[PDB]
Subunit: 455 residues, 3 copies
């Protein structure tokens, strides 16, 4: 008979819907195609990024640690299930003891020798009241939790390598713009050096033009540092090196990522891997309270073995020398000092700390999906205002170019308009990077990318 | 007899007082009332913040994990001291053993059937040389360590909810100031648009106005994202949601928190939770070294049982047959080839490990008090300076408004004055936030967020 | 007869050499002297750092926790080694079994009595199959992992105290520069106050100069608290206080850190501490696989002791009551419930988990040293441009001073020049602190400071 108590899923401390406000959008209350049913291959529309996901799925090491830990706790489940069945094993035995004058059968102090080679089982208990079955349920549900933690490790891997490639892709263009700013500053210094060599400009404007080009060289070396360190932070996450068969990836000024419907706060509890990892931890916990409840009842321990036993070693086997042994045994405690009740209360509040950690996990998941929704609501006008800034500075630069080309104003104010346009382009790229980074983090927060394609 | 070592605390590696230089004002010497017994109701003078902390102490989840691990180690202590008392309980033994005729005293190979229920104890050990009571002392003192760890979890949770609420308030004030700057740039852009339509301002000034207003719209969208970010962080630190029954909270410029005395560096040794849990873990190691010392000495064991063992299938409770077994056992390990000596060495250097972790914890506590005392010593001479900057820019705007309403300068210079005044007020509130979060961290470092009221 | 499989270390997932491009430097061949054998007293060329880092290694406490954990696992190795040898001891006894009348040999209920002390071993198992030797190898190789985990802790402590001392010097230098800018701003303010009383300047330029002065006072205070905060970080990281007999340390203008040959990625597999730590964890699991495989085979347990037995305690010291006992009780399993194969492939995939840990640790080490190589190849051409900026601004200030002394521009343009020069010097101090912390992290990533001088 079993003794595991029943289970109801606890009411999460999440509210009814996602939070509303000036930052957020409007909720679509449908769950037709959720996020975890959308694979990463349809979500990411950059093919070299897709093969970087495909090579980081196979040549990583943290995902390998997780995918080996799931079969490690599968083996732990196999040994905790194997404790249920008996231990049929051949065990030899013998004795050569002297007995004194009072313990011997003869009366004179002499020795006696008895040897035994049998087959059977020692120190095994019959599971009649559900204890090792409860340990088996605890190990099974630890195995299920470890599988879901492997899924969580793959989601937090694919989000990290996606945002690492997005940071590297943005910083390539950052270096490309910083080289053009260095070119504009260098040509401004060349014009001020020509104006100093003839006599129009003094040395003060020459120094003030020189300090700007050394500032441009300093920040150029800074962005080369940051590009190289982000290449190293990417080649850590891939495990293997960057491949040489890269297809032509898309530009950063396009739609790299598709939109995902957020859904309801009750859509997390069925498909988010970390919170139902915590739910299977709670499953192991109430299997453990089912184990601790079975410590009160008696445990039928049966130690049976059948073989041969003889005094003489000259005869290995004989028809008479064959023997068996049965030995039934029951044991229930009567009056302890409370160690059974202390273990029962210990397992009960292990279940209680695991339900506390479960609802803490759903609170953290709801917090990260909530500020992911806030970023989805705000970047769609932040980046649009930044594009209007870019169009305004681009019209300013082309208007300054078409008033330079006639001949009204000199080339130095044209370089000033050009470096202002380049600063605006750098701000546009470092804001599009934050939009794509938080969208990848929202995709990880909803249900993550586990499967390859949709279902 | 018990043989745990006679204990004295290690001396605290600190200075005799807090450091004094240009940054630190002056230490206060002996505190009359210490920093620990100032509850969070007579310390946080904001009533809305007091209700927020009152929700966070009853709805957040890490506090529940710690405040149920305290009963987990209650149950661990109870089972560890219940191991000492005898485990009396009925058991029914038995042999159904075929026994060969050469082993038989009768002569023919026959069986023997002796089985019967019997009440008593199996392998009960007495700690008369003091190992089990030392393990009891170890379990009790690491239970007290987990008690102090629960107090540390509470006094970190109060500080975290306070810092989240203060960052949320400062971000709402920054949202209001940047919304005012966006309003002033729209009030500049429509004037520049009319000056472009009538023909005075060229299109370059119009593109500069578009540059300014789209930069301010991007900054407004960034801050209205970040308000929702830290609001969801406050939702996580509460556990529950924000209640709708709140009073009117205090502002930033008003006195939000009260004064707390620092004291000696010898108050952290008594009234700080992590130092006390390191101390009680050192206590538990000082009991484990006593267990390893008592492992040398003899450990006697008494096992006895009373019942019936009549040799019949149908005869169990028959008058005139009562089993009365009473077997003691002594033991003394003479030669162990360096196992028990290695166990005593291991327990002694575990005690040394806990001494090292105790002094590491007290130095981390000393440093996180000392940097907060440095911030309280010199942030006044920054806040007064930034307040004088805000006052100087305010009277600068008042003189620019006098020049405008007289009629000397146009409206755009008044908008530049409002730009400078809004930048000054934004710098003032982002410094007041740093002050308040640093002295909240100072109050957490002195260890006073535990109790509800004062003493 | 041991069953541990013979090992060869896994091939490195790193590439053939360090990566090269435009940011990286062109690497040399192999190392004449390796990076871990570079003189630790010869690497840091400051007097003060070299005298303070001995106090750092002698009085910091995570290093002491590691250097006591190495003795802890030495004692655990001695326990696991002494478990192989027998454990002989006085196995005392004594039985008083009031047996019923049907089981006693006389036919009447009587008292059965045995007594006596007995010297010898009990339940000791012969380790001729490689089980306890494999557990001894597991303990020995975890000891050898922790012995260089202590070296890794010493490495990161040396790197952390070097970065803390360098950021202390950099914050004191930029504190001095901020104090000089506060002096120049105060001179600008009282010149504008002198030019305000007689009526040359209105009450707008005076307010602008006043806002500049209070901005300087706020900046001076927020650098004073930063100096007092990282000095407290350094006095945490030393453990003891800063000593008073400090020799004069040479500043950031001269050289501080010698050149270190990086070498090859094959050189990193023999001298970096945590790589060999993961290799010894791998070998510990590769001994645990032999420990799991050695349970298929028949274990050879033995029980042997020799004592004197009698009916009463008066017949203990009796010539003719001596006896012995000799029980070779072997055992061998023939039917398990898959537990043996589960333990076998469980230890096999634990070996594969530690393989994945090892070739993840090499990837993290290669990422750290590749970041160091990028910084070493780029900070030279960053700071050459930055010192050209400082030289250009300095001779700009010299031209402005030789413009001022003849009396054609004000003192306020001289203060503009001093503003430019001091901002240039402050940016130079920050970039050189970046170079020094990146090169200290390179020295931590290659081989660390463990050898006290050049080996």
């Amino acid at each position: 008979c079993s003794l595991i108590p029943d289970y109801q899923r606890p009411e999460a401390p999440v509210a009814a819907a996602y939070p509303q406000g000036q930052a957020y959008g409007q909720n679509t209350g449908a769950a037709a195609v959720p996020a975890a049913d959308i694979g990463w291959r349809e979500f990411f529309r950059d093919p070299q990024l897709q093969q970087l996901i495909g090579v980081a799925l196979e040549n990583n090491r943290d995902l390998r640690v997780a995918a080996l830990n799931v079969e490690a706790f599968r083996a732990q489940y196999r040994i905790q299930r194997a404790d249920l069945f008996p231990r049929i094993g051949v065990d030899g035995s013998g004795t050569r003891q002297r007995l004194p004058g009072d313990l011997s059968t003869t009366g004179s102090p002499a020795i006696s020798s008895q040897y035994g080679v049998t087959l059977g089982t020692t120190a095994w208990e019959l599971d009649l009241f559900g204890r090792l079955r409860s340990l088996r349920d605890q190990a099974l549900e630890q195995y299920l939790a470890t599988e879901q933690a492997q899924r969580s490790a793959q989601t937090t891997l694919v989000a990290s390598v996606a945002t690492a490639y997005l940071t590297l892709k943005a910083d390539q263009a950052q270096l490309q713009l910083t080289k053009d700013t260095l070119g504009t500053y260098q040509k401004s210094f060349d014009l001020t050096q020509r104006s100093y060599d003839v006599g129009v400009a003094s040395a003060l404007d020459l120094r003030q033009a020189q300090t700007a080009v050394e500032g441009a060289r300093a920040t150029l070396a800074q962005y080369t540092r940051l590009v190289a360190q982000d290449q190293n932070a990417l080649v850590l996450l891939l495990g293997s090196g960057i491949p040489a068969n890269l297809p032509q990836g898309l530009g950063l000024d396009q739609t790299l990522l598709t939109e995902v419907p957020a859904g309801l706060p009750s859509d997390l509890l069925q498909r988010r891997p970390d919170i139902l990892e915590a739910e299977h931890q709670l499953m192991a916990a109430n299997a453990s309270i089912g184990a601790a409840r079975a410590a009160f009842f008696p445990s039928i321990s049966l130690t049976a073995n059948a073989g041969t036993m003889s005094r003489q070693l000259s005869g290995l086997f004989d028809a008479g020398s064959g023997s068996w042994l049965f030995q039934p045994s029951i044991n229930l405690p009567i009056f302890t000092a409370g160690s059974l009740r202390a273990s029962l209360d210990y397992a009960k509040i292990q279940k209680d700390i695991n339900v506390a950690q479960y609802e803490k996990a759903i609170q953290t998941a709801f917090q990260e999906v909530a500020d992911g929704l806030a970023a989805r609501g705000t970047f769609t006008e932040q980046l649009q205002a930044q594009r209007d800034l870019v169009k305004a500075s681009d019209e300013y630069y082309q208007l300054a170019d078409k008033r330079y080309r006639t001949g009204v104003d000199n080339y130095l104010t044209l370089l000033d308009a050009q470096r202002s346009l380049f600063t605006a382009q750098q701000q546009l790229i470092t804001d599009r990077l934050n939009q794509l980074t938080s969208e990848v983090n929202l995709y990880k927060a909803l249900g993550g990318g586990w499967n390859q394609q949709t279902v």
